[PDB]
Amino acid sequence: VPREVEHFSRYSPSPLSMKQLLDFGSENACERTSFAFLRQELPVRLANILKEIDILPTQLVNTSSVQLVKSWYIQSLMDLVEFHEKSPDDQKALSDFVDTLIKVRNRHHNVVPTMAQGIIEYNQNLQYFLDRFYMNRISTRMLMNQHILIFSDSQTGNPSHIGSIDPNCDVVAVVQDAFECSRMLCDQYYLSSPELKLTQVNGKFPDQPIHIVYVPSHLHHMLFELFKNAMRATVEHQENQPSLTPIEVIVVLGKEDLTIKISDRGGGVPLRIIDRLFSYTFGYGLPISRLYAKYFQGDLNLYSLSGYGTDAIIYLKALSSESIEKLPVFNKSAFKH
Amino acid sequence: VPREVEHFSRYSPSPLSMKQLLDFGSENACERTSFAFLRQELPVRLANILKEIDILPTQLVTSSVQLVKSWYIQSLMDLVEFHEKSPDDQKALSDFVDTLIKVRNRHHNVVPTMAQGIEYKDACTVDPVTNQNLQYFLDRFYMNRISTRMLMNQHILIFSDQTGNPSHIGSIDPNCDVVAVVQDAFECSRMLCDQYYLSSPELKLTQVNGKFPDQPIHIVYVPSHLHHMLFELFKNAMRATVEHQENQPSLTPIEVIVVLGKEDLTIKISDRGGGVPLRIIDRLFSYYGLPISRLYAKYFQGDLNLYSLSGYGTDAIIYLKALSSESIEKLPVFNKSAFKHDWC
Ligand SMILES: COc1ccc(-c2c(-c3ccc(O)cc3O)n[nH]c2C)cc1
Numbered sequence: 001v002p003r004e005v006e007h008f009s010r011y012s013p014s015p016l017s018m019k020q021l022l023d024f025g026s027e028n029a030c031e032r033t034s035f036a037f038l039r040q041e042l043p044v045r046l047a048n049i050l051k052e053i054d055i056l057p058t059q060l061v062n063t064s065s066v067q068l069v070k071s072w073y074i075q076s077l078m079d080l081v082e083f084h085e086k087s088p089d090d091q092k093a094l095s096d097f098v099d100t101l102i103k104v105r106n107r108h109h110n111v112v113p114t115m116a117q118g119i120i121e122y123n124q125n126l127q128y129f130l131d132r133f134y135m136n137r138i139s140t141r142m143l144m145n146q147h148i149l150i151f152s153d154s155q156t157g158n159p160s161h162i163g164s165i166d167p168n169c170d171v172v173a174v175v176q177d178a179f180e181c182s183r184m185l186c187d188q189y190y191l192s193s194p195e196l197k198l199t200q201v202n203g204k205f206p207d208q209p210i211h212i213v214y215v216p217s218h219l220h221h222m223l224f225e226l227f228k229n230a231m232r233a234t235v236e237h238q239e240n241q242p243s244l245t246p247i248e249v250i251v252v253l254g255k256e257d258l259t260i261k262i263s264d265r266g267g268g269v270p271l272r273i274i275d276r277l278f279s280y281t282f283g284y285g286l287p288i289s290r291l292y293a294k295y296f297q298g299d300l301n302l303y304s305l306s307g308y309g310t311d312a313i314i315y316l317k318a319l320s321s322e323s324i325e326k327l328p329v330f331n332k333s334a335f336k337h
Numbered sequence: 338v339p340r341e342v343e344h345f346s347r348y349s350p351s352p353l354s355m356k357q358l359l360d361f362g363s364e365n366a367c368e369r370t371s372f373a374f375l376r377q378e379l380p381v382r383l384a385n386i387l388k389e390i391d392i393l394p395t396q397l398v399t400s401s402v403q404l405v406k407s408w409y410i411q412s413l414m415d416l417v418e419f420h421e422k423s424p425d426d427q428k429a430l431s432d433f434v435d436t437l438i439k440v441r442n443r444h445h446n447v448v449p450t451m452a453q454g455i456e457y458k459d460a461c462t463v464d465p466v467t468n469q470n471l472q473y474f475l476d477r478f479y480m481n482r483i484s485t486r487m488l489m490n491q492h493i494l495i496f497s498d499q500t501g502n503p504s505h506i507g508s509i510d511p512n513c514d515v516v517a518v519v520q521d522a523f524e525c526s527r528m529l530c531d532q533y534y535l536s537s538p539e540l541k542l543t544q545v546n547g548k549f550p551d552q553p554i555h556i557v558y559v560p561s562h563l564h565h566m567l568f569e570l571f572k573n574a575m576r577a578t579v580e581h582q583e584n585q586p587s588l589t590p591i592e593v594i595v596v597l598g599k600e601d602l603t604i605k606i607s608d609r610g611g612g613v614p615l616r617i618i619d620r621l622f623s624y625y626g627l628p629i630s631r632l633y634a635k636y637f638q639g640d641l642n643l644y645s646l647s648g649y650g651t652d653a654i655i656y657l658k659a660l661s662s663e664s665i666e667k668l669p670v671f672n673k674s675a676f677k678h679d680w681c
């Protein structure tokens with residue numbers, strides 16, 4: 001155990017809200033501040049999760065695949081710790097940091113499948129760990145991307161966005177895209193794909209467009225995954241008739257909640273097996289997409305009617321200020337689990 | 338507390354299935370067997386939940402629990418006697434029935450009392466972690482009552498000459514018409530609804546037999562339990578609807594769909610009462626009629642869930658097991674585990 005990882009674990013991750021993240025990019029010409037935050041936060045999160053890997057079962061940590069993960073994280077942690085001596089005023093430091101972050105985003109690019117093989121080689125504590133390990137990566141990928149897309153010279157992301165956050169996200173538009181994205185995957189395999197019957201309701205101000213601060217890609221991931229599932233299930237279960245049953249989506253904005261319910265008539269699944277769809281042990285989709293919903297204090301649930309069809313609901317937070325990161329911490333409360 | 342409650346605490350509850358239930362009274366499964374199994378079981382269940390009660394905070398264990406303990410200990414002791422008696426003593430069976438009729442009427446005031454104490458709990462001011470423990474304890478306490486009452490009714494209705502419906506086995510309808518139970522439970526809510534409101538929602542009911550398509554829906558179940566769950570969900574669906582659409586021309590129907598599947602009987606009641614925000618939902622389940630309802634669903638391995646759309650309406654869905662052999666009792670056990678009561 002390298003002295004830096006034992007050290008930086010001895011801190012707790014600091015969750016940020018999308019309001020705050022938003023701010024690192026507005027009147028704020030200060031990447032000076034992002035640099036001092038992230039050169040501290042990234043090592044802490046990586047160190048926390050490296051520590052929780054040491055408790056994984058003997059046979060598991062010693063898989064080729066986990067050992068490769070260990071070494072990348074340990075490498076990026078090292079690389080980030082080296083920026084600790086420089087000042088946030090050092091223009092040369094600010095820029096190397098962008099490159100090193102790009103370097104770490106790259107190094108970690110194979111992390112999520114590698115991890116899978118790592119388990120597909122070796123119960124309920126796996127699940128607990130995989131959910132945390134993956135949330136950990138979602139959160140670091142997001143902080144690095146955010147910094148990279150706001151400050152780097154040559155990755156400027158979507159101009160509407162501050163980083164990858166759309167402060168005025170057209171929720172239904174994302175629903176159409178993700179559906180129209182899944183709709184054309186399904187046509188690679190079937191003579192037909194379900195249509196989209198969609199309804200919106202604006203709690204706050206009625207008959208006005210639905211917009212909230214969110215990260216459009218995370219939403220896109222959730223919805224696509226759930227639309228693909230709906231379609232495949234609607235086409236398998238009705239392999240008889242001519243036209244399929246449409247897929248019904250309602251988008252609802254309320255005081256605190258942004259809710260999206262996706263309904264299909266794909267035959268459903270028994271209560272007993274639902275719990276397995278959300279298990280890592282196909283994917284990694286439903287499980288991951290749920291981590292995405294939960295990553296900012298939302299959620300994703302499945303309610304099926306075995307013999308008829310399935311409802312999928314996503315919950316997002318409606319206000320930037322309550323969209324707060326949900327981060328695992330390696331402490332004793334976690335130790336006993 | 339006598340050398341009794343501790344002895345039978347040593348044992349863990351033995352869950353029955355509705356199939357076994359159905360047979361403990363089928364083809365005249367002599368009251369001897371049921372006598373024998375219940376004179377053991379009921380004390381163990383009472384013994385079990387009684388030990389839980391002696392972990393409750395100083396003061397709570399109150400004008401309430403003070404008395405619940407007594408009834409259970411009396412009841413437990415009352416049931417003890419028939420150990421020294423043999424199953425063949427008909428005078429004893431006939432007394433087991435009445436002794437089962439007394440305990441009941443003794444316990445019919447359990448549910449009231451216990452929520453009294455909830456006077457007050459620990460210190461007369463109670464925090465989240467202590468409070469979560471109350472939620473914990475209470476799901477178990479009521480599940481336990483539901484389970485003991487269930488078994489006692491069964492014995493009485495099938496062996497005492499208080500006889501229920503002859504077509505039923507005790508409180509269980511081996512051919513429960515689920516859809517008819519939904520309509521009556523709906524109707525019982527519509528009336529109560531209309532004793533207080535100017536107008537009430539309609540029932541737009543849909544039906545799908547996945548198991549055997551054209552055929553009506555019948556599974557093995559206890560109609561009253563089904564009625565208790567459904568009444569409460571309808572009672573909530575209508576009131577949310579009527580309240581939310583004070584401004585609307587008419588009211589929208591409450592929509593329910595009944596589906597029977599390979600393994601599951603599923604019932605989904607949905608409304609447009611403007612819903613409740615994701616943050617509040619749990620409060621809805623905090624300690625009573627909704628919490629208790631969920632306990633009924635889970636009693637035989639089913640479940641009750643709400644998923645709402647704050648700003649539009651709400652989906653309530655009931656899950657029941659469609660096969661009798663899988664409809665097994667969900668009982669609390671007191672032990673090392675249960676006794677033993679991260680992210681930012
Ligand atoms: C992941 O592989 C799978 C596993 C199960 C299914 C599936 C669904 C379903 C499952 C999830 C959902 O959101 C909507 C649905 O209609 N309904 N029926 C089946 C057979 C589809 C893909």
Ligand SMILES: COc1ccc(-c2c(-c3ccc(O)cc3O)n[nH]c2C)cc1
Nearest residue numbers: 570573574577608610611612613651653
């Ligand atoms: C007084 O208790 C309550 C508390 C809250 C509600 C309620 C529900 C609801 C809640 C549960 C349900 O099953 C169906 C529903 O439409 N939706 N909207 C409201 C304001 C209704 C009764």
